[PDB]
Amino acid sequence: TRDQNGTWEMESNENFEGWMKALDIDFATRKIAVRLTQTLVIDQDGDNFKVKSTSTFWNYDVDFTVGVEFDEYTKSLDNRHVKALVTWEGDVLVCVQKGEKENRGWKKWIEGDKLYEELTCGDQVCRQVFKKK
Numbered sequence: 001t002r003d004q005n006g007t008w009e010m011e012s013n014e015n016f017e018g019w020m021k022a023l024d025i026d027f028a029t030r031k032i033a034v035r036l037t038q039t040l041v042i043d044q045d046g047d048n049f050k051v052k053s054t055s056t057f058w059n060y061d062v063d064f065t066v067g068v069e070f071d072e073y074t075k076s077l078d079n080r081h082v083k084a085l086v087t088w089e090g091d092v093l094v095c096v097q098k099g100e101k102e103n104r105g106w107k108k109w110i111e112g113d114k115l116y117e118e119l120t121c122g123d124q125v126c127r128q129v130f131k132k133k
């Protein structure tokens with residue numbers, strides 16, 4: 001299924017610190033952030049998405065249309081400019097963020113009642129699993 005609508009509550013988080021380190025996020029932010037449970041809110045209508053990543057420590061929102069490239073500032077994550085594009089590879093939603101960092105982006109897919117996510121940067125991969133609330 002390509003339907004990722006929902007409020008998604010984290011159940012598993014692996015190598016989140018490695019991904020943050022690959023983005024050069026400062027020590028203090030990384031050490032706090034690695035401890036925290038996350039929520040992902042996805043509002044999807046056709047090709048149009050609004051996505052929110054939240055914890056007690058951050059609230060990062062992005063809107064995009066599948067297949068439409070967009071320039072973005074990564075704001076309170078790492079304050080970089082990238083050229084972003086979200087597409088479907090089968091039923092995997094794939095974001096590539098072109099810019100200073102190689103292999104930068106994310107992937108999301110549904111396995112049952114769960115959303116699986118990869119966050120990638122450089123040679124680091126963070127793997128997460130969320131349950132639908």
Ligand SMILES: *C/C=C(\C)c1ccc(-c2ccc(N(C)C)s2)cc1
Nearest residue numbers: 033051053058060062076077106108
């Ligand atoms: C589909 C997933 C998206 C668009 C996403 C996931 C995770 C984040 C963030 C993780 C840490 C953040 N800070 C601001 C510390 S954001 C953003 C976007």
